[PDB]
């Protein structure tokens, strides 16, 4: 009869799930009355998000999805394409790539998609996207590979006018080639065409979340922008062709090793750095503990140093199956906890600002994957062998 | 003065120099008060129905030594007007509450001070988007209404603030969140009646313990009346405000009730005497202040018009506020003032 | 610009020595006549050049 | 050579027509002057509309199209794809589905599309839309079946960015699978993707207009909305999880049988009613004279009743080939006339607010299809055997 | 395995180039301060443009592109798909069609696309567009032939949501079928679907630029619009159904021969003229020196006359390989120079407002193609045998 | 609360007798000492309890 | 018209007892 994508879609759909997130966040307190002819310029607020995800491990119930959907989640629900409902928990997330991993709680009879090799993609190749555009459900749209970046973001015309960046990008064989994302951050929604992380990168970032707790991406800990910013002018910067250092992050390697706002990096390991962009991307091709010597500019300053795990990708209330923001520290040198909060449920448990945890409630916790591997097997007695540098206490 | 009028564009360049002196026991207002104002109003005919315009006005103090400059922009806006439909403009402009309260702001020197500048939607301020409909699509002569939005004007940038910043940020007494307001006025022959309402979000910087009158929003409700014919001018306005009226440097009044009234007569030979009364009564102020007068004075004055370009005036502010702890803390003037002015304008 | 660098990086050293402030740096680069060569360490994730 | 949709499009185009509507409506009288910086807040006005339609009966010259195009038409013109021009008259319309039927006056050598079976549609299936996007003519665009609702609105990516909801949705065999619609009422234009009524529903709604004069859809005659509305709050409603009754329609069954604004329906024939939506859709799966008992909420009120034909789908100046708003009444119990107007051309003929017409100018008029079947055969002498309950007069 | 457009795209891409234009223009002087709540109402300003182009002659390095990209260029750069960079110079442009020709300076090993026959296009035919949507590079998108005008602008759904009107439109065989354009002038960006000039017209307009210096399109030199304009009302025009003459262009044939603002043309060579549109398009189907008699309306006025080359398509600093706005004059009757500027680099060389150039610095210059053919072969000694009517001077 | 009732229902009677206003009700419940039993009719769709 | 805040001060002093280190 007539050609159709329905035959492979039937072998694919069981792997695509819907995701309903419920969570809260801090919003500013509304000042009243409200005057709409007056252009001006803390409380938790519940919000609801919804997106798609792809079953990537049928046994473990591992579902890949966008970080812009599950971010700040308190409750994450998943509904299979056959209608069965499950609960899910955060296992990992990485805001840079806008990719996150979750785990269906109590999976039973699941189907996982097969991942194809991103590296074999070519522009005229056919593409099919599957997502939940406006909430009304699971929509599939078709097209082709528009641009192969060459980070290799995949570009495709199988998008959706005014809709939210769905999820799965699949080839004509039903294999996963990329997860569609949203490059319009803290928004969701597209620029006109579609951007996907390639399947090979998805596989890679995803395994890290599993086997470590987070992705090994080191940060230079500087924060800044281009040489056009109001501050590059309001501070008049000499020789403009590089990355403007607006501030050096606290307790960072840039901070520790030496550097101060103003200097404009001009190179990284000999190579020219013409824009924060160039730099932000280059430092992203280097895993923790790496050493990268870069040239700065004040009069003619330059240094060499080693970076540590970034702070963007971190964990929260999913390490201890219970409930309560740690992350990994250097190589397999335990799990270092970061900025504690105000509610202080975890600080209340004797955990400060820089407390490592090499003791797996008794054993070795070189990382959050392991640590969490124990706070899931023996939920009975828990004594966190934490040692924030000196103090080696054992709280419950 | 119209200095340009050609091919459908007109430019009016206007201004004044006010040679002005204050006499007062209060030495902070006493002395030379000389100043000048300059401005332009331009209009361009786009079609027979559509006109574009812009206006700018600037004040430069004339009473300082040459090692300083005290000057500011009063208004700066651009707009479009469509015949028998309405107008829209955006920029630094007057809040719509002033459509009503302006009716009593007619005194030789003083007056118009139950509110101030950069004071939510009450007078001049930044970021006003203003929509106006005159004569109701040209079907009801004399009936006008307006709806206005004000965008947030927040904390200064580059000063270490971690929230509430805008590019054009300022001190908290002159901040505002997003606001909306409206006005309706009707004028038949000599008579006028009007009302206005404003509601602005208040910023976090404004709602700290350092300021009295904490609140989510600033609201104002105004009614006004006018008579303007037969060489007689009479007007009165009454305004009730919530977390909107400044109490000197202390912050704002939880509630205030403001009243202004004026009577003026124009003699044929050029003399225009004026009598006015203003008061602002604050309630539930906090810090033990309870109910207090924020403002209370009788103004007697006169202007002599030599012509439309030269005039001279005397204005006498008889200040009925008494010197007490509250007025001392807030820095509110309680002394009388006599102003003498000589004004050239074009 | 030519050699390589982009806004944001915070120089941490100049020829091995610590650079704790633009100040320190502006003054150090002023103790070096044209054509000189000075390798400094930058910070983005861990970048450095000569 | 190369594949192409041109070969089947050539067998399809003769069935797609263009439609030009001319008509008027009541607009408010402009108040001058106009102040664009002043956000404020009867005369007929001519307007022009244009859309596409599909020839569905070559002999009768029956063309299906969107109700948002022909609504309020005074004059409806049709132009075939070969360029021949014809006049058309309203035969039926149904605002819910946004589907309407018209008849070419004096057809000669027409081609009708074949309708395929909507029920056999599947998501990866290929789709082709044909319409008049911006007026400039007849545009065809292609794609696939995105979502099969499952009312079964069909979702497809063969739409158009910023254009008006065209008309025909056809499969790769040139058969009609759906008529594209506009879910952005009293606008036309899409949300980002395309929504079509399925061909099987089109066939069904369309036959009703033919053989009855209108579609048999009973209304519960209530009007209201959700429990979020300002009136659900301004009136504080206890137990919020249902349909809010803002008002009970006059001379309705809800009115007649018993019900009053405020009560929030909680169920319909035992089943839960969590939203006006749920309810509006459920009452739409029930033809006139049906009986549906529903539970209300005031303190704990519930009733049972039978509904009558809705008022949305009605007729006007097309019943009497002449010119002048009736509709059907219950089963084949004549044709009941509704709200007369101000110009009063038909009221002037002795027709009040509730006048039935069982007399076919002499015969049986159990319905508008029949009635109109007579005011078209014998346009000579006309005596309307109308009886508005008691009075059985015979006007001309 | 699976079907893909990648195999033909690999045979096509080497012909698609990227184009970076740098140039300036006259902008008004900003009046400060800036008041955003005040709706108001000369200096060169540099700007940057970027677009795509197609190699159409491998030997001559001829690249076709949109006039909205190269217009006002001072510097035009081209980058091949393999990454080689070249410089380019203007050889021709035509704002009506929004089509321009350029020449790579110093081509080496280039590939040209094969042009297919536009006339054989049909609506269901498959289409593929190649362009640089948002600057980020060369994107390809696919689809079909939506509307075949029938000027034959091609309409296709292979466009891009919110992106700039790319360039090449190619069929499934990799042959050029149209150059995509922007009908949203002095903007770039689409209406929702894509508009392309057909390949056959591209070939035709393009050869003219080569062999003459510009395209032979005669103008009636009137300027005006419809009968709805404020001036058609503000001047009350009797009998409204034609083209409103707002002004007769100076030194024009309409001017010379006879005509004055107000008259509404009603016909052109006997045929009805119901809109400026109709007329602007009809006069565009007539090459220079043609004679077209049209009927005007004042009380009942009508005339006959012959038109000359339009002024929209002209040349500038590319005739003399050096640097400095001429155009062709009638048949091969030399090259007539038009409106000189203020910088006066060319006026400074003894060239007035109406100076012809039949002397090829010694030879025959019946046209700009020839003239430029000489100012490129012998860049040594140059004596322009110009004669602006009478004066026959010989400047250097 | 214990026995059963939820915001929204509008009491229509108290022990058979009509309840046309909170007033009527507030006063009627005030003519009954602790431990008393009073069955009233509520309204949601048609709910009533004791 | 409460929270601890760190501040920094700097000044001079004079050694007045070398043995006891009194300034």
PDB file of C-alpha atoms in Angstrom, chain B residues 18-25 29-35 107-111 297-304 312-318 335-343:
ATOM      1  CA  UNK B  18      13.150  82.660  37.447  1.00  0.00           C
ATOM      2  CA  UNK B  19      15.174  85.123  39.536  1.00  0.00           C
ATOM      3  CA  UNK B  20      13.990  83.860  42.879  1.00  0.00           C
ATOM      4  CA  UNK B  21      14.709  84.431  46.564  1.00  0.00           C
ATOM      5  CA  UNK B  22      13.373  82.721  49.709  1.00  0.00           C
ATOM      6  CA  UNK B  23      13.076  84.369  53.122  1.00  0.00           C
ATOM      7  CA  UNK B  24      12.814  81.935  56.027  1.00  0.00           C
ATOM      8  CA  UNK B  25      13.955  81.248  59.571  1.00  0.00           C
ATOM      9  CA  UNK B  29      15.552  76.817  52.331  1.00  0.00           C
ATOM     10  CA  UNK B  30      16.584  80.452  52.948  1.00  0.00           C
ATOM     11  CA  UNK B  31      18.467  82.452  50.288  1.00  0.00           C
ATOM     12  CA  UNK B  32      18.952  82.499  46.502  1.00  0.00           C
ATOM     13  CA  UNK B  33      16.717  79.974  44.704  1.00  0.00           C
ATOM     14  CA  UNK B  34      17.314  81.236  41.134  1.00  0.00           C
ATOM     15  CA  UNK B  35      16.799  78.672  38.394  1.00  0.00           C
ATOM     16  CA  UNK B 107       0.313  78.461  43.089  1.00  0.00           C
ATOM     17  CA  UNK B 108       2.993  81.114  42.363  1.00  0.00           C
ATOM     18  CA  UNK B 109       5.822  79.165  44.052  1.00  0.00           C
ATOM     19  CA  UNK B 110       4.663  76.534  46.560  1.00  0.00           C
ATOM     20  CA  UNK B 111       1.810  73.998  46.427  1.00  0.00           C
ATOM     21  CA  UNK B 297      -0.143  75.202  55.431  1.00  0.00           C
ATOM     22  CA  UNK B 298      -2.029  78.214  54.143  1.00  0.00           C
ATOM     23  CA  UNK B 299      -0.561  79.880  51.087  1.00  0.00           C
ATOM     24  CA  UNK B 300      -1.302  83.502  50.243  1.00  0.00           C
ATOM     25  CA  UNK B 301       0.260  85.068  47.171  1.00  0.00           C
ATOM     26  CA  UNK B 302      -0.098  87.086  44.024  1.00  0.00           C
ATOM     27  CA  UNK B 303       1.367  87.196  40.537  1.00  0.00           C
ATOM     28  CA  UNK B 304       1.553  90.280  38.371  1.00  0.00           C
ATOM     29  CA  UNK B 312       6.693  88.853  39.050  1.00  0.00           C
ATOM     30  CA  UNK B 313       5.261  87.223  42.194  1.00  0.00           C
ATOM     31  CA  UNK B 314       5.239  86.980  45.967  1.00  0.00           C
ATOM     32  CA  UNK B 315       4.131  83.785  47.725  1.00  0.00           C
ATOM     33  CA  UNK B 316       3.779  83.501  51.525  1.00  0.00           C
ATOM     34  CA  UNK B 317       3.730  80.014  53.033  1.00  0.00           C
ATOM     35  CA  UNK B 318       2.115  80.284  56.460  1.00  0.00           C
ATOM     36  CA  UNK B 335       8.796  77.442  59.417  1.00  0.00           C
ATOM     37  CA  UNK B 336       7.017  80.021  57.230  1.00  0.00           C
ATOM     38  CA  UNK B 337       8.579  81.062  53.908  1.00  0.00           C
ATOM     39  CA  UNK B 338       8.214  84.197  51.769  1.00  0.00           C
ATOM     40  CA  UNK B 339       9.200  83.817  48.102  1.00  0.00           C
ATOM     41  CA  UNK B 340       9.804  86.715  45.723  1.00  0.00           C
ATOM     42  CA  UNK B 341      10.238  85.938  42.056  1.00  0.00           C
ATOM     43  CA  UNK B 342      10.819  87.744  38.775  1.00  0.00           C
ATOM     44  CA  UNK B 343      10.316  85.593  35.689  1.00  0.00           C
TER      45      UNK B 343
END
